[PDB]
Design a protein around this ligand. Structure first.
Ligand SMILES: *Cc1c(COP(=O)(O)O)cnc(C)c1O
Ligand SMILES: *Cc1c(COP(=O)(O)O)cnc(C)c1O
Ligand SMILES: *Cc1c(COP(=O)(O)O)cnc(C)c1O
Ligand SMILES: *Cc1c(COP(=O)(O)O)cnc(C)c1O
Ligand SMILES: N[C@@H](CCC(=O)O)C(=O)O
Ligand SMILES: O=C(O)CCC(=O)C(=O)O
Ligand SMILES: O=C(O)CCC(=O)C(=O)O
Lengths: 384, 364, 394, 387
């Protein structure tokens, strides 16, 4: 019968299915296509959940999230980054994905023009499209560090209602430099445009990269989106938060109660223990493993002949220009899996226009995977 | 400073805040949730999974094991054959409604629902740009709509029905639901069947049925929140018609990525004999509570048929003011009908999912 | 080709001790459920409840946060501190943390206490009826066990005077208050007298205080041996009051002179107590855990009242004072010459399972029966219905 | 006179005493490298932990049957078949509160007070101390490089007056040496012929290194022997206090009666959890620990030669190197105390394991991280030449 037109959005995951089949049929899978850590939640988080299963009913919490977790997040902004955030600014969400749903519904009406970098995270486009917004792609390249600029925003016509930035970004790993983000933030205020700052990969940054910064260092008019999924490796726990501007707090409160009732309560109780010294050590321990992995991957890539890369500043991705080896990146990735069993993500998923020249490689697994993958690509690539 | 117009929806919870402030001598009969937590096999499975599983993202539609278990439950308990592919795991029924409304309806579509009813259907649909058509229902009919009642509306794309319903507790009788289901097919209207309170039914009063007994064109919404008391675990499921499966798959991956994975792994153990015994044990406690409440109320006797864990009817004394005063005076907390019905709710909703002591002490 | 004599296969003589027969009755009960399914069990020597939720939560967290390697032999400081503070907060006696030694149950505590205090051949006295395992441990460890027969006259508990009359002299005395199987508590004055006598007579006192916390209204008050004399060894457990029976955790209050001996023995014999049990048991001293423990006692009190009142009605009115624990020790002599036969028949006929007194008293136990009221009230009520119909036709 | 029993006056388990000394160094100096531990640095495998976590929700955790839960008994019996090809009946298996609890049962069931029980020196100190406290006569058999630090049948044959019992450990604390299959069989056979009870400590089974003699169960030769084993070392369930005995048919009634009176039952949460030790995942994690030990062993042995300590007991299994330090010191106790005070490296003195000859010897543990081994080697290398 009837299917809604707005429901007809592109899919997000499909590559992950393809990889899974290789293990079942061949068993030689090296996976560098994942958009998640290989590590799970830190042990203090797991311990808190284990205790809560005995001590807590796990009924509905208050819509905005438990006070303890809100207090802990607010205190983390001070203790680690020297910005004063009131607990009432923090709203707990069902992942950053849940946070984006709230942010887009509270900030934008149907037909509003919202801008974002390409390449970028595909789901922003797809959520905004389904919610009836007009998505304005800003093509970004090596010239501007794969990130938008204030000037680039200024040139856009007709005017925008919203801008979404991500630092560090999926799939590039590049961070917007503090000055540029501040400029972008300042521009938005002046232009009466709402800024959505994806800060999901904060905490996962590499040495010699530009420093990361919160949008609330410049402007509190911006909506900050963050998660427990990446830095704290609580990916399947579906927990994140928003820093909500005062004017939008009533709207966010009403929407969250109706749409979600509350975030996962076991995840909430457990996540308070993410802000312990032990959990932070385990999180930073994962980053240390990533840094080693990054070095091996970058150095390996040059040797095999892939030297044009987006600046790997953070996250756990290398965004690689593979154009010399192929006209179509989708075909390239499919073949490599079929031939070697090494699984990588095609750039088409992140960029419809220019992605066919590009590939995304994840280094959040074991070093063995990176090392073995490099051996296999090195033997395979010259005969392509 | 710009706030979206669509964001300006009514809130859901407000009574729960009022009760919290009192903690007088609080007796709470205003809750929309069980007082019990998850069954012990569910908790045990989660405890084990914290050691054995990474708890990364699952596949968007949910883990095969949980999908298989839900499909098998429809057969084993209710004699309807459901394919595992029909089942889509969601972040609660609230997450399920988001998917159902986005997949089935475009902005501007007319979707009908009973009043009184669950406030969040109106508020989700309004925010998603749909046109909400209230169907006022009272004692004269089921407090559930009928095909004829739907037929008389001019000019619908969708109908949402709930059996048993919040706040009445009434079930749509199997014949009437089938009729409603059949009408929808004939009229080319999409049916959203809220079946969240299935498994919580009382001796006699009507009987529950799945929409898929009559028509597979309807979307079935269900949850682990009420029968399995996994309220804070945020886990539910949809039975999705074949035509809508691609749309639901694409939306869920973009909007949620996947449902809570620890909740998914744990919920497989909900379909054990031990978990079912604990769930039915809760129902036995509710039945006792129901009897005490109904009999006590008469000693106010005009109520919606208590076929969930709610009693929905008083007018002689006043409803928003009534409830506020009773809490301030006695400390007994009850929900005002205004939250469920804007037109006629100024009615009361009393919850009996707590301990029997609370029920007994409550009357004054 | 040729047959030949085989050398006698050697089993130690000291190993030839009686079994803990309370386990044997538990086996008999189990068969009734498998074959008939009508079992009402009043024969158990343990709570029907498990560990309190804060204890379980602490263990669940420790499985994630702690390696669970060997602890220090005497037990973790936190648990030792908590036990010492409990003596003050609840009973107003000052106990130094160093006095507390954590053990693998009270059973492990008795092994340490008996090895540290007594040599082989030493005369150690105990009440009969009593807990069978004291006799069996002491016998196996080469001590001479002196039974003191106790009855209604002396509240089924020894007295200082009774001890004074014993010849030849004793090296040790074991008292239990509340006791298995009677449930009687030694009154504070009498225990003090017993404690004082021991000091004067240079006799070591072993005070079993395992059932402390499980006492009923109008019973004599319970008291620690260390209120009178610190020369006595106090034995206690998490098994009964805190229902941590399978966790195998308890403690000793060790006199200063015996601390070196206990330390050396425990490290060699056990290395350390169960570490997960240790970490978890710190949370037993929370308000929530104490409420759950006292909640169990409230359920027992109700059960006690139903059982006592029911027993009089059916004609069993001569009982040991049910002061604590969760046992009624009943004189069934009017109904039977042999208690072992009585219990076997009742199980075969009604399915109600009770413990024969022979297990606790070899000499006089055949007149006696032990009934446990730590299960659900339904069990008590149904058991009373079944005995009432069965007994008059015996 | 305030009375303490004479039998109570035994030596302490001095391994614990060294552990106390090490602890102080971390609190005061913070430079502790610990190679003195008698336990794995790893905890229980994740399937074991998961089973315990689930049991806390699903099980009352009351007393089990005295001999241990059927499931765990069945799993242990099946492990002897599946891994080592010996058929063991579930009734032969008795679950105990560690091997320490197992030794208490074994010694009480097999020996009366005054019975002569023999053991290798150096060896695990607790056998002597348990047997002494239980009133037995302990017969030390001094063992050295000549006989691989392990007793022989011939060595046993020479002992006068006759013995009632023999305790052997393979692999042993503190040497790490395994008794070769032939020699253990010979020892087992001798015992039967001589009407002497054999107690076979098999606690470190599963922790063996490449090119070492193979390990074997005493029940491959004789079922008259008592086998003692544990979850403490191979399965790293050290604080769970769980082990088992293979009990000869004649001793089963005695062991049953003693265990019920002395312990009631083993730790029930540990029992339920340990069933999951026999999963493929748990075995992989256990073997993973061994792989880490093997690396550590190689670094330690090679490092020791370079610094000048080259006379060692054959490191066949366990996680110990038993090192002859006589060239560097007359007293090993002083040596270890000084090294801790000077470098912060903590090692165990041989006196704890051998009262007569241990002052020439030292025990080094390699169950920690490789960093510890590597750093320890750097520190000893700088310190030793000026001694
Ligand atoms: C992985 C990822 C997400 C997912 O966030 P959740 O908190 O798991 O919903 C969102 N945005 C970006 C840019 C990501 O890379
Ligand atoms: C609880 C409830 C739902 C679903 O809520 P979830 O907790 O998200 O499953 C739907 N309708 C009514 C009337 C309810 O009470
Ligand atoms: C149960 C019991 C004990 C000890 O139990 P543990 O678990 O070993 O602490 C001690 N004495 C009596 C009289 C008992 O009934
Ligand atoms: C460490 C060790 C044990 C351990 O005893 P458990 O009770 O298993 O911890 C037993 N025997 C020997 C020889 C050891 O070295
Ligand atoms: N009355 C007991 C307290 C019971 C307990 O906490 O174990 C005592 O004297 O120690
Ligand atoms: O958890 C973290 O470290 C991220 C906090 C954050 O938002 C920031 O660094 O700005
Ligand atoms: O080495 C063998 O054959 C037996 C191993 C063993 O004792 C065990 O199963 O732990």
């Amino acid at each position: 019968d009837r299917v809604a037109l707005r429901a007809g959005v592109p899919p997000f995951m499909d590559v992950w299915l393809a990889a899974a089949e290789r293990q079942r049929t061949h068993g030689d899978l090296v996976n560098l296509s994942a958009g998640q850590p290989s590590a799970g939640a830190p042990e203090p988080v797991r311990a808190a959940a284990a205790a809560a299963l005995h001590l807590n009913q796990l009924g509905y919490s208050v819509a905005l999230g438990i006070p303890e977790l809100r207090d802990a997040i607010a205190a983390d902004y001070q203790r680690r980054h020297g910005i004063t955030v009131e607990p009432d600014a923090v709203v707990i969400t069902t992942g950053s994905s849940g946070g984006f749903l709230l942010a887009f519904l509270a900030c934008f009406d149907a037909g509003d023009r919202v801008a974002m970098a390409s390449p970028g995270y595909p789901c922003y486009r797809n959520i905004l499209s389904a919610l009836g917004c007009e998505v304005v792609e800003i093509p970004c390249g090596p010239q501007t560090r794969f990130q938008p600029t204030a000037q680039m925003l200024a040139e856009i016509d007709p005017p925008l209602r919203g801008v979404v930035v991500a630092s560090p970004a999926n799939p590039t790993g590049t961070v917007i430099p503090p000055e540029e983000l501040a400029a972008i933030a300042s521009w938005c205020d002046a232009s009466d445009v709402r800024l959505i700052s994806d800060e999901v990969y904060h905490g996962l940054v590499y040495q010699g990269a530009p420093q990361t910064s919160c949008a609330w260092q410049t402007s509190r008019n911006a909506v900050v989106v963050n998660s427990f999924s990446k830095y704290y490796a609580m990916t399947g726990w579906r927990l994140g938060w928003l820093l909500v501007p005062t004017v939008l707090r009533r709207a966010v409160d009403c929407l969250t109660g109706n749409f979600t009732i509350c975030p996962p309560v076991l995840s909430q109780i457990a996540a308070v223990s993410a802000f312990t010294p032990e959990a932070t050590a385990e999180a930073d321990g994962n980053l240390a493993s990533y840094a080693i992995n990054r070095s091996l991957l970058l150095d390996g890539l040059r040797r095999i002949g892939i030297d044009r890369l987006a600046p790997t500043d953070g996250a756990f991705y290398v965004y690689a220009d593979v154009s010399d080896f192929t006209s179509d990146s989708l075909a390239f990735c499919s073949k490599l899996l079929a031939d070697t069993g090494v699984a990588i993500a095609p750039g088409i998923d992140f960029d419809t226009a220019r992605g066919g020249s590009f590939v995304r490689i994840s280094f959040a697994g074991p070093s063995g995977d990176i090392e073995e993958a490099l051996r296999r690509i090195g033997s395979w690539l010259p005969s392509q």
